Write a protein that binds this DNA or RNA. Structure first.
Ligand SMILES: [Mn+2]
Ligand SMILES: [Mn+2]
Ligand SMILES: [Mn+2]
Length: 327
DNA sequence: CATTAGA
DNA sequence: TCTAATG
């Protein structure tokens, strides 16, 4: 957690690189497992040799560990850090729509900057086009303050369209968080579950609602169960307009809500931990359900859920307010 | 890890 | 169809 830090972070740097600037899936995969095992080890690594005893720790990485140990640095690391092309990739990459693939492609084409990308909006797609447009705003955080204002409106039309809806704005938001990166709306309806072969309109209806009113401003992607977009709070009585916000609404079979809800609400750790427990408690949890375990090794059969409580009751735990679902 | 775009 | 990008 800190005793083996530099080595971990170094490695991950090492790793993230092969994956992005290079196509080295494996090497990359390599650095990762190592970066992982080394992280687990209870002692201070004092030499490669030492590291080397480890699983996945080869001659290659160990060599790397020595240099870092020995001198507060690494050239390869230093060289990349400098590498304009490489740099370039990391950059283009913050463009929502922009992935390593495009990144490289763009690069090779000579498009290395924000401006470049502008100059050739043509060479970009709608997603990337939007991304382009709201680069600054997509990079900006979202004050809960807004989170509150946003939530409000959303719940408002949701309700207006059909009173039978159920929306929950999950994530860190839901978790108390002073700020968030985007808004996650979980969505369901009685008239939609496991078997009840859709009602795409279920989704449809709302986005359309949201739009009609000006909450939704763009479409990143709209599918029959997952919309992905951009929003903004009505820029008040002037002098102060609002930054463009990434928003995501999703349809869910009323029969799987709370799990999903539980789930997306995190924290990643909370979940893992709760989930770990459900194992002892003779259960199974995952993003959609909760199944009782059968000694044969495994088992099925989806226990009925109506609330975040059921799942809790199930595994006989303490109801954790989302506030304190931190871990 | 599943959904969406796109080509 | 596959391939990429988000989450
Ligand atoms: Mn070994
Ligand atoms: Mn990106
Ligand atoms: Mn998200």
């Amino acid at each position: 957690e800190t005793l083996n830090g530099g080595i971990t972070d170094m490695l991950t740097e090492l790793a993230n690189f092969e994956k992005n600037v290079s196509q080295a899936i494996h090497k990359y995969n390599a650095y990762r497992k190592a970066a992982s095992v080394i992280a687990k080890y209870p002692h201070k690594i004092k030499s490669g040799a030492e590291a080397k005893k480890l699983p996945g720790v080869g001659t290659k990485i160990a060599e790397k560990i020595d240099e870092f140990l020995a001198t507060g640095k690494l050239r390869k690391l230093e060289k990349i850090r400098q590498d304009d092309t490489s740099s370039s990739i990391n950059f283009l990459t913050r463009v929502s729509g922009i992935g390593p693939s495009a990144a490289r492609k763009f690069v090779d084409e000579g498009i290395k900057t924000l401006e470049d990308l502008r100059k050739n909006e043509d060479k970009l797609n709608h997603h990337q086009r939007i991304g382009l447009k709201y680069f600054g705003d997509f990079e900006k955080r979202i004050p809960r303050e807004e989170m509150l204002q946003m939530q409000d409106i959303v719940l408002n039309e949701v309700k207006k369209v059909d009173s039978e809806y159920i929306a929950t704005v999950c994530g860190s938001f839901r978790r108390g968080a002073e700020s968030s990166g985007d808004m996650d709306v979980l969505l369901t309806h009685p008239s939609f579950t496991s078997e009840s072969t859709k009602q795409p309109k279920l989704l449809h209806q709302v986005v359309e609602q949201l739009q009609k009113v000006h909450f939704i401003t763009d479409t990143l992607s709209k599918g029959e169960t997952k919309f992905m977009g951009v929003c903004q709070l009505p820029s008040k009585n002037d002098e102060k307009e609002y930054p463009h916000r990434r928003i995501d609404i999703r349809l869910i079979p009323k029969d799987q809500y709370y799990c999903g809800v539980l789930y997306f609400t995190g924290s990643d750790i909370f979940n893992k931990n709760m989930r770990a427990h459900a194992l002892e408690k003779g259960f199974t949890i995952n993003e959609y359900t909760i199944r009782p375990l059968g000694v044969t090794g495994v088992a099925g059969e989806p226990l009925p859920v109506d609330s975040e409580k059921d799942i809790f009751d199930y595994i006989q735990w303490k109801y954790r307010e989302p506030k304190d679902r931190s871990e």
